[model samples]
Structure formats: structure tokens, C-alpha cells
Target: DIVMTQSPATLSVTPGDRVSLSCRASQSISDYLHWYQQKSHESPRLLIKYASQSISGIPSRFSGSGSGSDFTLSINSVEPEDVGVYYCQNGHSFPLTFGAGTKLELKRTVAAPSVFIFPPSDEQLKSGTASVVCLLNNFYPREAKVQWKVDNALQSGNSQESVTEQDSKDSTYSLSSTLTLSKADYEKHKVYACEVTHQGLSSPVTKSFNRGE
Candidate 1:
């Protein structure tokens, strides 16, 4: 199976900056590479066709270059309105392939993620074990730090964090960390806290979880 890999999964840009996004294929795709742009709440519009060929009605600043397995999409000067996701597709083979896509966003308008600490289920409590989830949603700029604490003490080796891009074109990112521990801690009234730090905020945001509320 052929794979398409894109670099810099997310890109932060300022107005008037020349940007180049890369897409590489597992095998040579020749000049069959094409590029598309998708904005929030809108359909994908073809920007470049058959490698470097320009599409009608697309802006002149948007262009494509390179061939075979490697290709680049260049923006002469990025604009605020140009913030969106760009995808590269290969039409050279039997099975069509599209890259994971690169999200373009404004660096100054980063959105802070919302934090939520989910309570453990009744089954988990009955089983003497619990899995509490700390979720962060709708954030921008990608980089963030998540931490979990028990009774104000930092807990380690009991959490697994996963970061995923939202399916929508809002161009935001999501992260979740699962903290597993004994339900006896909660029964003893232990305090569980989730701390999220992002560049969009001046201070870290903390949310707590306790069965007694």
C-alpha cells in the first residue's frame, strides 16, 4: 500500500509571509499530484491540478511545484483569509490517495482549549479501579502541556495522552489524557486535578474532580 505523508501537520502563519507546505508519497506519483484548499464550513476547492498546473479562478499567489514522490505547495504571501487546511492528492494510480492535510492558522489568534475532568463510571467504582479522563478541546497553535495531580501532588506513570485534530475545518486541536488509579483514593476523598497550560493563556487552567462535588 502506498502512503502519503505530510510534514508540520499544523502550520502557524502571519499575514504576508511566504509559506511552503510539503507532501511526499511512498512511490513515484509522477505529475499526478494535485492540491486542494478547504476552509471552515466549506467544500474543498481545487487549487493546483496535475502537479504545477494552475486552476481557473484560484488566486495567482497559490501555486504548486515538484513532481514524482515529492511536491510542494507555495503561497507567495499568506493572508488571514487563507487560513485553512491544504491537502495533496495523487491521481497517478488505481487507488486514489490523499495526504493527511496541513492546517493553516493565524499565529496571533490562537484559541485556548477548554478543559474537562470526567468522573469515573459506577462500574469502575465497584471494580475498585477508576479511569478519569482529562479532555481539552477546540484549541489552536497545537503545543500544550497537560498534567494530573492527586491531592495536590503530581502523579506520574499513570496517564496516557493523545492529541488529535478535529475532523471539522475549524482548524483546532484536541487532547485527552486518561488517568488510571484505585477507586479507593476517590472513596477516601482524594482530590484529582487536571492542569492545562497553553500559549493562548497567561496562566494554567485547572479543573478538579471529586465524587462528592
Candidate 2:
């Protein structure tokens, strides 16, 4: 698979600064680079096509440059409404790949997400399985991670994650992580933890679920 990496993952920008977002491909992709603007709580809109070709309906301030493996998406005098992530896509190869994205955020403050861990329901345990959920809510910048730890060890398998945009006035993002374990295994562990890392905080926040609590 061709991987696309975007540089300066999180950019803090003023309202009228000129912004240049970079995207590079693992292999040469020629001029097949495309750019998209994704606003908060909205789908991505194609801004530039074929490396530098302008797309209709997109503002003139949005432009693209570079060819082959290197590409750039520039915004001349970026606006406050442009606070979102920009992604580059390579259409020149099979199994099209997209960049990790550069998030353009205003040079201000961001909200830290609230983490909540829920104990397994009795019905789920009765079925011989335990489903533990960790929810991260009301977070800005949309960059957060959730992991499950069983007795101080990381549990990578049997986990599911989902991110959703909230409908509140804050326009923040919500994330959920669920770890499934057998009833026997759940009871075997003395402590289960939900560990969260966010961009807005200085340290990791952990919530624990003790057995027989």
C-alpha cells in the first residue's frame, strides 16, 4: 500500500495567515495528488484536482502545488471558517491512499475531553461475555486515543473504537472504545483501566474498573 504522510500534524494558525500544508507519498505518484477541505462536523470538499488544478465552487484562496511524491495545499490568508483538516489523496495508484491530514486550528484554546468508563452490564456478563465501554466526550481538535489495560498490561485485541461529531453547540467530537472479554477473564483480572491521551492535556487520564466494585 502507498502511504501518505502529512507534516506539521497540528497547525496553530491566525485568522489571516498564509498556510501551507505538506503531503508526501511513499512512492512516486506523479501529478495525481488531490486536496480536500474538511470542516468541522462536515464531509470533505474537493479543493484542488490533479495537483494544481482548481476546483469549481472552491474559494480562490485555496490552491495546490507540487507533483510526484511531494505535494502542498496552500491557503492564502486563511479564514476562521477554514479551521479544519486538509488531506491529500493520490489517485495515480491502485488502492488509493490518503494522507493522515493536517489540522488547521485557530491560535486559541481547546477543550479537554471528559473520559468515562462504564462497568459491564449484568445481562452481558450473564451471556458469558463482558463488554466494557470507555467514552471520551466534548473534546476539541478531535485528537484523542483510548486504550484498555488488563492488570497493568495493554489489551490490544478484542477492542472496538468509534469517533462521532457531537450535535451540541460546542461542536466537539466524541469517541468510544469498547473492550470485550470473557466473563471468566474479566473476573480473573484485578483491575481494568481505560487510558486516554489527548492533545489538550499534559498527562494521560486513566479510569479504573475494579473487580467486584
Candidate 3:
């Protein structure tokens, strides 16, 4: 019995970016290495069949090479919609087995969430309660989760998830989310946390805030 393992688990890239996926077979399968793309909520697709041979209708950017010991799946350029999970399958006879799939979470222009806070304006300061916004900017793939925490508790209310904007110039996608809390909630809570979860990240990304500081 042999196993196929994918390294890094997840590969991140932008449109026009290049990335290569490695697939190692526990034993030589002799032209049995295969690569597949499992896009979000879709069935696994055959990208490269029979190690490095084209199956037909697959994009020209997708390619595979190397023998059993050093198999490589290379994507010459990246596209936002092309982001998906990748898997390496082995052609075996007498026994059946597969394990460890590789995934791609497109992170064009920005890989992780670059967080920033927007405090109340001068006029808002006059109000007894002001709006505090947490901005999660420049995140790719457009499929990410944003959370606002109040004193270690996840808060929900008056939050906005704007439509993702794709830049024509850079060919990258970005989104903004706002978590507006009253001045009382902002000052009372010791910690205001903004946490993001994306397929590209192995672990969730978090940012903390201290009012006016």
C-alpha cells in the first residue's frame, strides 16, 4: 500500500501568478500521478490526467510534469476564479488508496486580511454613543469570514458586509466590513477583536483594538 501527500496543504496566488504543487507517491506508481482541482462547493475535476498528459478542455495554464519520485503540478498564471483545492491521485492496480489533498485559496494582491479601524469623527464624538468600524481590507478570493469580538465574546449587530470589489487595474479582489459599536460598548469592553477566517490561512487571523489608541 502507498499514500500520496500534498505539501503546504494550501497554495495562495493571484491572477497571473505562478505556483507549483508537489505530489509525492510513497512508492513508484509509474505514470500514475494525477492532479485534480476541487473548487469551492464543486466536485473534484481532472486537471491533469496520467501524470503530465492533457485530458482536453482543461485550461492551457494548468500543467504537470516529473516522474513518480518528483511529480510537480504547475500553474503558469493565476486567475481569481481558478482558485480551488487540488489533489494528487495515484493510478493503482490490485489495491485502492488516496489521501492528503492540496487546496488553493486565491489571494491575489493581498494574501491575508490587512486590518484597520475607523473611529468616530469629530461630530460623532459629540454624540453620547459613536460608531466604531473594523475594516478588513485587501483580502483575496472573496470568500472569507469576519468576526467582531467584545470582551472575548463574538458580537453581532449593525455589521455590514459590502459586495466584493475587483480591481480592473490589479486584477485582485477586496472587501470591507464594518462593526459599529456604541461609544458605551467601545469604551466598556476592554478588547475589541477583529478575526478573519479564510481558506488560504491555516489559522484564523485576528486584530485587537484600543479606543483612540
Candidate 4:
């Protein structure tokens, strides 16, 4: 499997500002470019492909422009809801590769920091009583944490819940966590969250999941 690493690790951008994310492949990956956004414990949403193509249902503000070994994911106007970790993946091959992520945040110099938030997908809810999982590819620093949350509350004491880490190319780490919920929980438009906490970071990043209406 090829290795991919994101630069900066975090970013601070303002509304209407243009931002770009760079993703590099250890080896040639052809045209298997893909982009995703994870907001606080939710499933990731595909944003781009082939380096520049847009995925259906995604906002036009989100765009990808790049090719071959190097690729870039860009957001034309940084929206409050866009403030999170943006990752790039290449589906071109097995052991799929992903960038660590570039987080978008409010510019401190500006007044009133706006927070970005995205709702969960419908699939998460429709599955009804399904198990939601989070996979962290090519993570490093060895020690990491993965856990599940519901409706902004932590779902602790889950007997079936589990976390696992594995090694890959380039001293990278991968972590996966799963949580089970009832169908009724999904019907209520509940929010499910997934978080990955690693060393060398000030805080753990999260992605959120909501039942599609």
C-alpha cells in the first residue's frame, strides 16, 4: 500500500477564503483521486475524484484539482460548516491510501469565530439498528484512540464496542471503532459521532452522523 500524508495537519481559514489541501502518493496511483470531509464523529463524505471531478450531492464550493502523484482538494469559500478535517484518498489500488487531513478553522485575527458543522447521512439512519464503524488509515505515533458517541453524548459501557490498531507502510497506524444502536434511535434523527485522538495533537478530531430525513 502506498503512503499519503497531509501537510500542516491543521488550517485556519475564513469565510469566502480559498483553501487547498495537498495529497501525495508514495508511488504512482494513476487517477484514483478521492476527497472526503469528516465532521466530529460522522461518516466521511466524498468530495472529489480523479483529482478534479465533483461528487453528486456535494456543494459546488467544494472542488478538487490535481492529478497523477500529486493532488489537491480545494474549497472555494470556507463556510462555517466546512471547519473540520478534510482528507484525500486514492481508490485506485488496494490497501487504499489517505492523507492525514487539513483542518479548516476560523481566522483568529477576525471577529467572532464561526464553527463549521455537518449533519450525518441518511444511510446511517436508514440502516436502523446498524453498527457504525470508523477506520483511521495510516496513523502514526502508535498510541491512538477511537470511540463512539450518540446525540452529543458518549456511548460508554458498550460490551460489544471495540478498538483495534494495525501497522502499514511508512510507520503509519490505523484504528477502527464500532457502536451498535437500535432502529428507533436512527428514526429519531439521532446524531452519531466518531472520534480519533492521537499523540502530538492538541485535541482529538471528530466526525458526526445523523439520520437522513
Number of the top TM-score candidate = 1
Clashing residue pairs found in predicted model 1: none
Give the TM-score ranking, best first: 1, 3, 2, 4
Q: What are the per-residue Cα lDDT tens digits for candidate 3 across 1-213?
A: 677877878666666789888988888888877888876567889999778999799989999987755688998887766765788887764465554777666654436656675666758756766665666666556678888776789877767877444443443456677777676666676666778887667898877766666
How much lDDT does each candidate structure score?
A: 0.85, 0.84, 0.72, 0.65
Q: 1-213, model 4: which lDDT tens digit per residue?
A: 678777878775656789888888777777788888887567998888777886899998888776668877888886657766788886788887788888765442211111123343456656655666666555444456666677777778651433332221132334555566666764564676776666544677777756553
Each model's total of backbone clashes: 0, 0, 2, 15
Q: How large is the C-alpha RMSD of every model relative to the true structure?
A: 5.2, 6.6, 9.3, 14.9
Writing each residue's lDDT as its tens digit, candidate 1 over 95-166 gives 788899999876446799999999889977899998899999888777999989888889889889998744
Candidate 3 global lDDT:
0.72
Tell me the TM-score of each prediction against the true structure: 0.62, 0.53, 0.56, 0.50
Better of 2 and 3 by lDDT: 2
Off by over 4 Å in 1: 1-11, 15-18, 22-47, 54-62, 66-72, 76-108, 166-170
Candidate 4 ranges beyond 4 A from true positions? 108-213
lDDT of 4 at 61: 89
Of 3 and 4, which scores higher on TM-score? 3
